[PDB]
């Protein structure tokens, strides 16, 4: 979209969820810098009137700001032309089906909206893709996309590519079937949809899909139905509830798929042993856990790389695909950096999916490494949950080395990424499958999480995606479940789950400014400019999967609660973090 | 209470709801003043995890803060020893009966807690007087006082007298019978209770009640039975849901009663005309609308003055009674200043209730003045709603010249009060009484409100309670529903319903600092000191009666909703103020 390109190119705006199509989350503004960040102070705050995890970020287009709250997903439009104050312009309150609340696995969170040609597009938890007039907030059109009865809920933030609104949804834990569709920007009608599994026609494979990497899986083999048992692909997960990227020059949309569904691996293979089930090409559970590159016009996939075939830990691969150009191995190549849940930082050639680098960015014991030739992980049997009635320990836990919280990078130094990380393990015990009803809880496994190192759960690092070494490592008592933000002022912004919003030096990582906000910070900090002055805004309010024991009011005495999070939350004082929702803005 | 006197005498604390027994709401901390307030910035914020109106204020004792949220009335204990940061000590979540929400007339608010001898006392909306251990938050004792089935809800903040916990409740609009009782600070029973009407034995009228002012009403006449029709006193209102004060030297507790029940005056008298109904001593509806001075040990009343006999406007007299010594009429007299809802600022001799001054602090057209000789208002017929089916305009509206938002005064200059004010009128149309069921809405009147002057709703004034003239008047386009705070740094603090927190100069009223918070401010600002640094804290989140159309989600197309607030709220952009709940702390 030409308008999105113009807006995102202007450093004064935050026109895209991740600041641009490449999801760099980098701001060239330098008014706020290392020299004066000590004087950072709140300018104004805005309550959302809603309580639960406040994920995502606001959108800033010139003098206007748009905020999307969690369920019921209220859209607030604010006038910020004065910079040091705000004025509510209008409010859009969609009437939703509350069944989506109980059909949501990890919270009633929303990851933001997108803007283009005077229109605002967002996803409601009940699966509606809505387009509103940016000026008056009048509903231009809404299209029912996700079905709650099939276990699908639309948590992510869609993006706009030339004239289409592309997005997915979640629901692998409810037996849903992943889908990624495009809707006309002006009409809202569906143009095409690509399933994460099923026959080749259902996946919309390109004519030259993985032509350069036949070892990744090609068309004409119907891996979407064969790498699954009889018809488990119908409940085979693969939901795309993560972040979406776009390469204008190459005309490629990048997105990833979730887990293959239920957490009992024996039910995703006909083999009886871990060794036989992991036989290559037999039960890969494709195309779940795959990084896709599709053409926006038709949706045909140019290439696709599955990171975790035959999943056994719920290592959803949806994490954002940051696009940058890095000089590595003697030349400048168009790279795609992706911090996957499985604990591996993948560096791929965004032109054909070629594996450039794959290093562990957290403790990883389920796999030895990623085989460069076959592109498959060298799994460790004693750290792969397979049998029913046996608990197996694994690093990282189901939450992985990094969940949906996005990373940030400065393109001028594309090899150094600022990334929040999870540092806890788990013991997952598969259970017997009690039903095959789509739209109902479809996990069948008991989980227990202990933080790897007591007193240390989250870690904000300056990780070099080429050498696999971190410049600095900041350990935090609470998890680092907020997005990152890097600025040309020499600062890196992130927030902790107990409410601390911090600013650190990009070079050393020492904290230069910090303030404890109202609640846990699971939003993504943004940087924009109004009236010639720079502002930093971030959402607060505990929630998400990490905050489910609090937002859902679960019992702290049941450690298995929340898929293995209640016990860890109860042990690390999460229940003492009050709920909330509020946008904090700072200036110098 | 001895402990309370010392904690309140120490300027570093805010140990009482109104900073002290006299409710002066004045802080001597000059560490923050008129020359550096421009640099006042937020130090930290704490979300309550609860929505709707956040009235009241926190309690700072040493370096421990206690905050009482609105329903379910969660009590948060914060460790503020670090000063610029906070840590939760404990949390108390009471199990309540949800009908208290539907039985609450004007939002699910709470006005704070009191502290003494390591104990925290507060009121739950469902009518429970709770005492918690300050250190651990454990429940020391719980006593059921207010009955929801009888239309009673406990919104006010109790205070701790020597060894008694005294409090009242609300529910005049539900046909409740007002009561004011005391409870043992250690065990928790009711030591005594005094009704606002009924036989003299129920009102606890001492042998020397109104000795120096027989024209007020004396014991032995059973006015609480005569001034009402046959048995309407059973639903005679008089609830004491306002602020309570205490004079240790005189050993007297000060509290006032509310309206006498329904808003259809023809049902609170057996006369057929306004003149006959207003005959003195016939239908006074005593002891509603009465300022009471009682002995804490027995509860017997030393004196009582009814400001509005035979109420016809719902001019609840519960407003705070600030106790100060003022040099007037040739000498320094122990006074009681009270900005009543009827629009008159009463200055009475706190020893016997003698009327010293009665000045109009806002536009008042229902009464010409207050006669000293009779102590009764000179009513204006054309502005006194009486008959059924006749809309009658009145200044001020039912919300009065000033609702529960407390005023502030510096005893150094006891004649000048910093008081928020309401500046809108109404057209009240009495209606036929459809029922006599206690516990159900008991009003029977169609109300419509409109600001007296366009573009002006609230006004923060510097009012001389002796001369009746205002030093300065600050007009606000939104209501000034927040309490006031005055400091020895030459500053006065208050907030607006749209979220603006302001710091004005005491001498001129000029705004020296202002910031828009997350939501409407209906909380009371406080000043305290920790680690040698002065801090300013206030609660935010729209609510209360003024904000009920937003918190209750009332139809904006129903002007009569919220007892007339909906129409005015819909016209002055109240619906664009998001809900919230968050405590903000500032420092220089
Ligand atoms: O597999 C799915 O269908 C699905 C959805 C979501 C979601 O929609 O929020 C999460 C997950 N899976 C998941 O595995 C996960 O760890 C997770 C964390 C969060 C969050 O917002 O904090 N959502 C989700
Ligand atoms: Nd998942
Ligand atoms: Nd009332």
Residue numbers in the entry:
A (entry chain B), B (entry chain A): 32 to 619
Lines quoted from the article behind this entry:
By cultivating M. thermophilum AP8 in medium supplemented with 0.5 μM Nd2O3 as the sole lanthanide at μmax (0.051 h−1) on methane, we aimed to study a functional neodymium-containing methanol dehydrogenase enzyme and determine the structure of the catalytic site. The crystal structure of Nd-XoxF1 contains a dimer in the asymmetric unit, of which one monomer contains no PQQ molecule and the other contains a PQQ molecule and neodymium ion with approximately 70% occupancy. The loss of the PQQ cofactor from the enzyme is interesting and could be a combined result of the exchange of buffers and the high salt concentration used during the crystallization procedure. The two monomers show the typical eight-bladed β-propeller fold of a methanol dehydrogenase, a conserved disulfide bridge above the PQQ cofactor and an aspartate residue coordinating the lanthanide in the active site. They can be superimposed with the structure of the cerium-containing XoxF2 of Methylacidiphilum fumariolicum SolV to a root mean square deviation (RMSD) of 0.8 Å. However, a detailed comparison of the Nd-XoxF1 structure with those of other XoxF-type and MxaFI-type MDHs reveals an interesting difference in the direct vicinity of the active site, namely, position 172, which directly precedes the Nd-coordinating Glu173, is occupied by an aspartate residue in Nd-XoxF1, whereas this residue is a glycine in all other known MDH structures. Amino acid sequence alignments of a large variety of methanol and alcohol dehydrogenases reveals that the presence of an aspartate residue in this position is diagnostic for the XoxF1 lineage. To accommodate the Asp172 side chain, residue 240 is a cysteine in Nd-XoxF1, whereas it is a bulkier threonine in XoxF2 of M. fumariolicum SolV. With respect to the XoxF2 structures of Methylacidiphilum fumariolicum SolV, the presence of Asp172 (replacing glycine) results in a rearrangement of the loop containing the metal-coordinating Glu173. The coordination of PQQ and the lanthanide are almost identical to the coordination in other XoxF-type MDHs, and therefore the overall coordination of the lanthanide is not altered in XoxF1 compared to that of other XoxF-type MDHs.
